[PDB]
Amino acid sequence: VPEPEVVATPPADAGRGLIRVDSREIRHYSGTRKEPDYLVSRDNGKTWEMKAAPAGYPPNYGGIPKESPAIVRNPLTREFIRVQPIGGFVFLSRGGLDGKWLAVTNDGKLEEDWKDPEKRKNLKKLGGIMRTPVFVNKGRRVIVPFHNMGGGTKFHISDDGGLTWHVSRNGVTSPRHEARPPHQGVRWFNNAVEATVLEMKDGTLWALARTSQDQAWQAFSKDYGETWSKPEPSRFFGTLTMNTLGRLDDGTIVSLWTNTMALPENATAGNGTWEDVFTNRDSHHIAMSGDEGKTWYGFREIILDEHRNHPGYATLDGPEDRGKHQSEMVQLDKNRILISLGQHKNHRRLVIVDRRWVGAKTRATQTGKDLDSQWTIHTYIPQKKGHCSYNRKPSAELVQDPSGGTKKVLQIKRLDDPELVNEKSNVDYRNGGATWNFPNGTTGLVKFRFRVVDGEQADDSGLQVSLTDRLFNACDSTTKDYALFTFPIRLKPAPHLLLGMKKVPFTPGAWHEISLLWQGGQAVVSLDGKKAGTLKMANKSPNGASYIHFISTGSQPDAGILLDTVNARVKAA
Ligand SMILES: [Ca+2]
Ligand SMILES: [Cl-]
Ligand SMILES: [Cl-]
């Protein structure tokens, strides 16, 4: 099955400006303050180059340098509407992207002569931070989500193709984060911001919005956006990152988001007006639904941030926000989807994904071969750097397999590294760990191979093994508290699995395999092919399991354990 393929770096952060021109030509516009330009492919997304926009295309009067305006085709007129992420004007095309453009005036007319600064004074200016215009109701209405950081999302609405505008009665809101353990402070408050909107088959609109909770929140409209239901949590985990919904030609719904859990807030987190540090933006994910959202499949990692382990992460090539959050998509053919994702020139990417890979039911890995592409292992140096960033270290390293041969395997232990401690913030990220994604399942079988390192161990040394429904940081010792299933491998007094109350011993200094076969609210655990015990589900999930997470448990420096292979198979549902 075809794995995700990086094809280019877009000329702006992802989320706005990716637009199909015709069956073979696709563009990604930019936030340049100079003469406008775009990145273009003429082979349906495979190869790309920069090009200057023609003289009729208006500069970015509003916007910001790192974000393109959103550009959307009106399905009735086949012309385009352009709005910025913030500020500026509403432009409508006549003759397509490379035709004439006109700006919408405050009195519902079109201004052809927007190069005259005096004539720009009476142009319509839509307020707030805006996301993507979406045409709804057989193309007869266009709505543009907009927000205020603490005030919530509402919708700019036009019933005449962008000439005149009104505002929805209400929109989407979400509650402040409450500092309770394991947090030591409050998360940055965003009030249901950055909404993505999809029209459902029954005519309802579904809005999915970014929040300070553990998941995105959602509301629904029965009148094409004028009024919205009470907001509620969605099934899509994630915090303070962006959601994007779309629909393929055959009606399949696509959900793109960053499916992560941030580290718990520290003791210097601030009052929640602004962020202190980002610990959850190093991945992007996809799920799809063929039945109007009743059931979902996939929840697969599109990509991990290539810089995620590095001790210069926060400041390489300028301090601007970086990562793999934010996205926008264009279907390429029956099977393939082009996705722009991420932020910062060193991190943002255009990636082709295949729906047959989204719908796959198996995955396998070997740490020595697959660490750089598939494994999240980073710990953080807890000193804020750049803009709301931490520098990182790999929390685990590859070593020679003690059995001999050429295999390299991953050593997971409690680290002797004082640079991973901040006593004022009260965090200690010295427990190394590792986590790996697989296609989502409410029933499945995962197997992994591990070995105890021959060396000094602490009294609490071992490995906490968890199945989770989003990506928890490798160094997050609270993962078990949120997990679907979890158990410890304990090394003292002698090595054993603890499965409820049952201890199951095994030999140190030898490779062993453990299997977890989960279904509903319980999992069966096997060791070296023999049933060992059972586990009761610790937390329910709206979706199922899509990660296995391993974290060392020693509280003093130890030798730990080695991890070799993992494989997963899930049931179709
Ligand atoms: Ca925070
Ligand atoms: Cl840029
Ligand atoms: Cl503009």
Numbering used by the authors: 25 to 595, 598 to 599
What's written in the study?
The mucolytic human gut microbiota specialist Akkermansia muciniphila is proposed to boost mucin-secretion by the host, thereby being a key player in mucus turnover. Mucin glycan utilization requires the removal of protective caps, notably fucose and sialic acid, but the enzymatic details of this process remain largely unknown. Here, we describe the specificities of ten A. muciniphila glycoside hydrolases, which collectively remove all known sialyl and fucosyl mucin caps including those on double-sulfated epitopes. Structural analyses revealed an unprecedented fucosidase modular arrangement and explained the sialyl T-antigen specificity of a sialidase of a previously unknown family.
To explain the strict specificity, we determined three structures of AmGH181: in ligand free form, bound with the transition-state inhibitor DANA (N-Acetyl-2,3-dehydro-2-deoxyneuraminic acid), and bound to both the T-antigen disaccharide (GNB) and DANA, which provides a mimic for a transition state-like substrate complex. At the catalytic site, R234 and R305 are shared with GH33, whereas glutamine (Q367) substitutes the third arginine in the GH33 conserved triad. A unique signature is the substitution of the tyrosine catalytic nucleophile in GH33 members to a glutamine (Q350) that is preceded by a histidine (H349) in AmGH181. Strikingly, Q350 and an adjacent glutamate (E218), both invariant in GH181, are potentially hydrogen bonded to a water molecule that overlays with the oxygen in the catalytic tyrosine of GH33 enzymes. This water is positioned for nucleophilic attack at the C2 of the sialyl (or the inhibitor) at subsite −1. Based on these data, we hypothesized that AmGH181 adopts an inverting mechanism that involves nucleophilic attack by the activated water molecule that overlays with the oxygen of the catalytic tyrosine in GH33 enzymes. The initial emerging signals were for β-Neu5Ac and α-Neu5Ac, in the reactions catalyzed by AmGH181 and AmGH33A, respectively. These data corroborated the proposed inverting mechanism of AmGH181, which is unprecedented in the evolutionary related CAZy clan E that includes GH33 retaining sialidases. The presence of two potential saccharide surface binding sites (SBSs) is intriguing. The first site is adjacent to the active site, where an inhibitor molecule was modelled, whereas a galactose unit was modelled at the second binding site located on the opposite side of the catalytic site.
